[PDB]
């Protein structure tokens, strides 16, 4: 995250850390959607061009974290994946289209002041909140600067931008499974996700029922916080029918 701040304690209790067993290391962000399931970007697990193809075994899930680096002795819980599911039509070849994956935990986690799930949007909720101008919030332990790593979880509030402008800022082909967010060079406010923030949640708070909803997943971008550039996220509501599906077939 570029131009954000440290999160307050328990500000984002669905925030999950994707963690490598050896070298033990931060892979990506992700989010708690129930006591057994985690939501992240598919490219966090499968990205052939970087020779990336992680297995259930390659990792751990860290929930309830604040500190990037410390092992939060009575706060955080570490879990093991029972399985990984990637959107069958996720496109690593041309533009990270359908950048989405689900992870089923070996054992259901217990919620706490620091551990609590995010809601998935319904058609009406998405209908009304995914509007150009409306702000969302992103969190992650990622790069602070395009060129480093924070000590604590970072947060930023960013406005959704019109598809036209999103499309006109880049050479890459944008699909309906993506939305972009950031400020306009004239709006004079900064911030963005950045390398290492991948897989993290872009959430909105409903004004109707005052619940926090997850609308996007941190996907890709061009540099971090550059004028005329915007962060791109996986449009969670559009890939919902796929999510429903796998949960209904493989668990809970």
């Amino acid at each position: 995250i570029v131009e954000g701040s440290d999160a307050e304690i328990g500000m984002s209790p669905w925030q999950v850390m994707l963690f490598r067993k050896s070298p033990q290391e931060l892979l990506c962000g992700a989010s708690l959607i129930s006591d057994r399931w985690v939501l992240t970007a598919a490219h966090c697990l499968l990205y052939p061009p970087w020779d990336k193809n992680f297995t259930e075994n390659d990792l751990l899930v860290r929930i309830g974290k604040h500190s990037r680096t410390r092992y939060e002795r009575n706060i955080e819980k570490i879990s093991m994946l029972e399985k990984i599911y990637i959107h069958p039509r996720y496109n690593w070849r041309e533009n990270l289209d359908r950048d989405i994956a689900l992870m089923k935990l070996k054992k259901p986690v217990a919620f706490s002041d620091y551990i609590h799930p995010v809601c998935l949007p319904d058609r009406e909720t998405a209908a009304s909140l995914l509007q150009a101008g409306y702000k969302g919030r992103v969190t992650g332990w990622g790069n602070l600067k395009e060129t480093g790593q924070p000590s604590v979880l970072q947060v930023v509030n960013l406005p959704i931008v019109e598809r036209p402008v999103c499309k006109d800022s880049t050479r890459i082909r944008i699909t309906d499974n993506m939305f972009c967010a950031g400020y306009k060079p004239d709006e004079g406010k900064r911030g963005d996700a950045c390398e290492g923030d991948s897989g993290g949640p872009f959430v909105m708070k409903s004004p109707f029922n005052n619940r926090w909803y997850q609308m996007g997943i941190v996907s890709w971008g061009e540099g971090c916080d550059r004028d005329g550039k915007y962060g791109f996220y996986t449009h969670v509501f559009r890939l919902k029918k796929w999510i429903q599906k796998v949960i209904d077939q493989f668990g809970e």
């Binding site: 609590h116 101008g133 004004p207």
Partner: peptide, 29 residues
């Protein structure tokens, strides 16, 4: 767990607000 979803134990549940959530709610015109 998604049922008590999106109500944070240290904010919503105690009816305390975080430092910038008001910026969000204000953008929803």
């Amino acid at each position: 767990g998604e049922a008590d979803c999106g109500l944070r134990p240290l904010f919503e549940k105690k009816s305390l607000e975080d430092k910038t959530e008001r910026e969000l709610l204000e953008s929803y015109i």
